[PDB]
Amino acid sequence: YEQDKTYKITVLHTNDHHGHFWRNEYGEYGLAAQKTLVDGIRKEVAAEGGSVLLLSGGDINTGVCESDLQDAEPDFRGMNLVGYDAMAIGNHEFDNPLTVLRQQEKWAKFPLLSANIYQKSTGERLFKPWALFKRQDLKIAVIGLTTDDTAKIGNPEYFTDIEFRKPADEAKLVIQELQQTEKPDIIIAATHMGHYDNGEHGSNAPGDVEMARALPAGSLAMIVGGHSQDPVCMAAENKKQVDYVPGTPCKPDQQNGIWIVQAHEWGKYVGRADFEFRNGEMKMVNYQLIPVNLKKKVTWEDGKSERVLYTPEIAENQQMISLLSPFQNKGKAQLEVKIGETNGRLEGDRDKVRFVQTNMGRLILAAQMDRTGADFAVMSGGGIRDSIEAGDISYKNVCKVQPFGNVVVYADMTGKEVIDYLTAVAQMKPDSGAYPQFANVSFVAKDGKLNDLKIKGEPVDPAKTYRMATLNFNATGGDGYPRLDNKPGYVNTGFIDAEVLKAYIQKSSPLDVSVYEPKGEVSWQ
Ligand SMILES: [Mn+2]
Ligand SMILES: [Mn+2]
């Protein structure tokens, strides 16, 4: 680069797209609007003599059935048109077999990067660890990293010949590699690792803050992140804003001379970091999270409700609409097909499944016990994402109920462990996602202790072995549930929550909700 010359470089970023190629039911987000916003930034930046690099923190797969059905083809092809330069591989890129990920690399015209994922048998990397870009006179390297929690949360059959090195240790090595060989002017890490306030990762593997603190000072200009699914907007030192509001200031985190950003999820924002580079120094001039047609419900005096834009409207790019329309239309029509029926409403509304036992909890958990051979089961009420009305049930119905690709697991445990486990889970409170839905469990909890604890209507015997089904999310400590993934009787089946529910409905249809109706088997008073 030219000595003492000041170069303008803008870094744009998103993460945890999760199948949101199309705008939502309220006209929010989608890639067609993303494209208009991004093109606009590119025009603005080029007119001032600058450069743009656009990066993703991964988790493109899983979350919208029209996308999932098509293995995120629309999403990757849309990203080509928005003009992504690279992406970190997320954990949900392992929701499908590796061969599917390889064809996603095919569709993508930008590299899917991960330095820290190795084939055990050969000790060789499965993916490109980094990529190089020329922007004006500057050589910029982007390293990709993936949370080593991937191997704990996904299907273990996908990982028998794979290991994840701790990404922070990989990062030290790759940064040193680059510094000694290719000699880039700037290094940025695209990561799928998570932002945790003050590095307090808890049950999660260490993420971005802990990595930044462990690297040499200022060795990365920035970490473009993901996985935790936060807008990284700092209320105070080492504390993110809670309930960040669109269209308000966002101060990114900075740890050991390294900026850490994340743009929440689903294409809701494009982050924009405007830098000046001179003689190796990078200075951030502006940071913002730009809403992509985000909207808030409002109600006027006369009771009329509408959804109003937090910021001015972004038009949908029509080239994107022509590319993506066919995928949307094909997908939607396919997923409306009937897979069974129910003679009553299966209640999955938030104000119910986070407060009382519902028939939807019982249906989901019946499906999970049936697949695993379990005697009883539990999940977070917050993992039940919609209702299914009486009548015909479609593929789309099941997706809305179980959109996130959680894996079904089980644990054989003694009755003594069952007592300890349910006593803890029974302390989760209503008016929270953590509120437990049970199947085949009865008790009266009083004073934090379980009375007349029965499984399948029989008192618990401390010596007897019971099989419990639940999700990978709860089993590994999600919602503060007691960890099961270290018990010797634990098995992660790799079966996906929505598949299991779908197949159960298929083989049990027509459903009679009377079979799934809670009758006070569990109570607190
Ligand atoms: Mn995600
Ligand atoms: Mn993730």
Side-chain angles (χ1 to χ4, degrees):
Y1 65 88
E2 182 180 322
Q3 149 108 61
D4 304 335
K5 165 166 188 188
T6 299
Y7 298 77
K8 294 192 132 69
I9 308 147
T10 288
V11 181
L12 299 189
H13 67 101
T14 68
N15 57 277
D16 292 277
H17 173 70
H18 280 305
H20 293 72
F21 67 88
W22 199 249
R23 63 195 180 247
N24 77 356
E25 62 185 301
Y26 307 122
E28 298 178 280
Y29 43 82
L31 288 177
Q34 200 180 114
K35 162 91 171 142
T36 301
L37 174 65
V38 175
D39 284 349
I41 296 161
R42 288 181 194 284
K43 182 170 185 175
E44 179 178 297
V45 169
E48 191 50 41
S51 290
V52 169
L53 224 222
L54 167 65
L55 303 175
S56 166
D59 267 9
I60 309 299
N61 290 269
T62 303
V64 179
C65 256
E66 286 84 1
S67 178
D68 304 355
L69 202 234
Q70 295 172 99
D71 301 324
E73 181 171 7
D75 308 83
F76 280 99
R77 282 196 196 277
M79 292 171 67
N80 288 341
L81 185 45
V82 179
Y84 279 82
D85 300 310
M87 157 190 141
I89 292 179
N91 53 290
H92 289 265
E93 273 63 79
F94 295 87
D95 282 359
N96 297 291
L98 178 63
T99 295
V100 169
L101 185 53
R102 293 302 183 195
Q103 179 66 193
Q104 294 169 345
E105 291 187 80
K106 213 311 236 72
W107 288 327
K109 286 167 168 88
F110 47 94
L112 311 203
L113 302 175
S114 187
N116 67 298
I117 306 178
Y118 286 83
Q119 188 114 75
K120 282 204 206 181
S121 60
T122 64
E124 138 169 356
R125 280 197 187 105
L126 284 171
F127 302 102
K128 285 185 234 48
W130 47 253
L132 301 177
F133 302 93
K134 186 51 82 263
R135 287 305 175 266
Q136 299 164 74
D137 306 315
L138 305 179
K139 187 174 199 190
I140 300 173
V142 182
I143 299 165
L145 302 166
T146 303
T147 175
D148 45 337
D149 275 336
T150 303
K152 198 161 169 174
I153 89 144
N155 179 351
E157 294 190 343
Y158 292 164
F159 305 124
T160 68
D161 200 26
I162 299 186
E163 44 188 51
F164 290 79
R165 185 192 235 122
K166 182 171 146 45
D169 290 344
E170 194 79 25
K172 300 171 201 205
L173 300 173
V174 181
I175 284 164
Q176 180 165 237
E177 187 198 339
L178 282 165
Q179 282 178 341
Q180 299 308 123
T181 54
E182 296 296 340
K183 306 188 213 274
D185 303 307
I186 297 157
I187 313 177
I188 292 162
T191 70
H192 195 100
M193 288 163 58
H195 186 284
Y196 309 112
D197 282 348
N198 199 37
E200 289 168 60
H201 48 77
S203 288
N204 297 287
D208 293 327
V209 166
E210 195 176 277
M211 177 172 66
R213 287 175 182 178
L215 295 176
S219 61
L220 297 170
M222 82 190 307
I223 294 164
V224 170
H227 183 70
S228 52
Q229 296 180 217
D230 308 294
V232 172
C233 303
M234 294 324 278
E237 186 178 349
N238 293 309
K239 264 253 152 290
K240 291 183 285 298
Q241 301 195 34
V242 182
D243 304 312
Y244 179 75
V245 177
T248 66
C250 181
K251 188 198 191 168
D253 201 1
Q254 193 184 14
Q255 299 287 326
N256 190 38
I258 299 169
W259 304 99
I260 308 173
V261 304
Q262 195 180 146
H264 200 186
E265 67 195 12
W266 305 351
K268 288 173 170 177
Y269 305 97
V270 176
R272 179 183 180 164
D274 298 311
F275 283 99
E276 301 282 318
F277 171 96
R278 171 174 179 283
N279 294 329
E281 281 193 82
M282 280 280 278
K283 287 186 178 269
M284 202 179 287
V285 308
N286 265 125
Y287 188 76
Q288 67 194 298
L289 278 182
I290 307 171
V292 186
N293 293 331
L294 295 190
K295 287 174 180 181
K296 48 176 179 241
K297 188 161 46 142
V298 216
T299 53
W300 298 86
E301 284 173 354
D302 72 335
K304 176 160 109 114
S305 217
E306 60 193 12
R307 274 178 206 255
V308 184
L309 285 158
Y310 283 97
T311 62
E313 177 159 27
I314 301 157
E316 294 196 300
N317 173 265
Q318 286 300 126
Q319 193 190 356
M320 187 68 74
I321 298 293
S322 303
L323 171 73
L324 295 178
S325 277
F327 294 103
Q328 178 66 7
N329 286 331
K330 157 175 14 180
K332 169 161 187 168
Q334 261 187 263
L335 292 164
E336 273 156 2
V337 321
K338 166 182 196 165
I339 64 168
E341 55 181 62
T342 172
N343 69 350
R345 188 152 172 290
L346 288 156
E347 179 69 77
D349 283 10
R350 291 182 31 123
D351 63 310
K352 299 285 187 290
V353 299
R354 307 179 183 211
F355 290 79
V356 294
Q357 307 293 290
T358 72
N359 57 2
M360 183 61 95
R362 292 297 184 75
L363 176 67
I364 292 163
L365 299 174
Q368 294 180 14
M369 294 191 291
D370 169 89
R371 175 66 64 89
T372 55
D375 303 299
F376 72 115
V378 80
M379 68 180 298
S380 290
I384 298 167
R385 294 267 123 188
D386 219 314
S387 286
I388 286 171
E389 324 283 19
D392 285 351
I393 302 165
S394 70
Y395 292 97
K396 184 64 153 161
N397 283 137
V398 167
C399 300
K400 290 196 279 176
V401 187
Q402 299 283 255
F404 297 142
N406 277 153
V407 178
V408 180
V409 308
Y410 70 83
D412 295 329
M413 72 190 92
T414 65
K416 188 246 182 320
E417 296 171 292
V418 165
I419 290 184
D420 291 343
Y421 182 79
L422 296 166
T423 292
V425 170
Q427 293 168 343
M428 300 301 171
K429 285 173 111 67
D431 207 348
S432 83
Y435 176 76
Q437 295 288 327
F438 301 98
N440 284 349
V441 178
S442 32
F443 58 67
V444 191
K446 73 118 211 204
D447 220 297
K449 149 174 96 69
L450 302 189
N451 298 290
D452 314 309
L453 183 55
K454 310 178 186 305
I455 295 313
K456 277 145 138 346
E458 295 306 321
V460 176
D461 183 326
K464 174 173 205 305
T465 303
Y466 297 92
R467 185 168 285 186
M468 192 188 74
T470 185
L471 288 317
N472 66 343
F473 174 77
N474 299 82
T476 55
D479 285 334
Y481 282 45
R483 283 194 42 183
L484 303 168
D485 56 305
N486 293 139
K487 297 182 148 175
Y490 174 83
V491 175
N492 175 329
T493 66
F495 297 125
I496 297 165
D497 53 11
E499 185 276 307
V500 170
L501 179 58
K502 172 261 279 179
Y504 182 80
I505 291 167
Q506 286 169 316
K507 68 166 182 181
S508 309
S509 183
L511 301 182
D512 177 5
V513 299
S514 132
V515 167
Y516 305 103
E517 187 43 45
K519 307 298 194 211
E521 288 80 0
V522 297
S523 55
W524 292 254
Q525 279 108 34

